[PDB]
Design a protein around this nucleic acid. Structure first.
Ligand SMILES: [Zn+2]
Ligand SMILES: [Zn+2]
Ligand SMILES: [Zn+2]
Length: 79
DNA sequence: TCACACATACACACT
DNA sequence: AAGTGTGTATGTGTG
């Protein structure tokens, strides 16, 4: 078992390390276009969509691609 | 081979 | 309306 700087003892090393990296504020994944640094890969992956303009999540009726999952979920809820 | 174990991506939920 | 954090299912690695 792997203790952390919060009292949470994680089962797996990797989860402790992810948690600690968040604690420190380390941001190893930076954008090579704008210059913002993110602490996790998928954060930077999602952010890249604004540089690359990829607009996924096509609405099933209204035909409105959205960049972000929550925006698409709200539009599907409303429309 | 293969049975298992841990890392990592990705959905999903927040701020 | 994009950044931040968590939980978990593959995928890869290994003995
Ligand atoms: Zn911690
Ligand atoms: Zn960027
Ligand atoms: Zn619609």
């Amino acid at each position: 078992l792997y203790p952390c700087q919060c009292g949470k003892s994680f089962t797996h090393k990797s989860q402790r390390d992810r948690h600690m990296s968040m604690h420190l504020g380390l941001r190893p994944y930076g954008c090579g276009v704008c210059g913002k640094k993110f602490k996790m890969k998928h954060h930077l992956v999602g952010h890249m969509k604004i540089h690359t303009g990829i607009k996924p999540y096509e609405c099933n009726i209204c035909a409105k691609r959205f960049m972000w999952r929550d925006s698409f979920h709200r539009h599907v809820t409303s429309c």
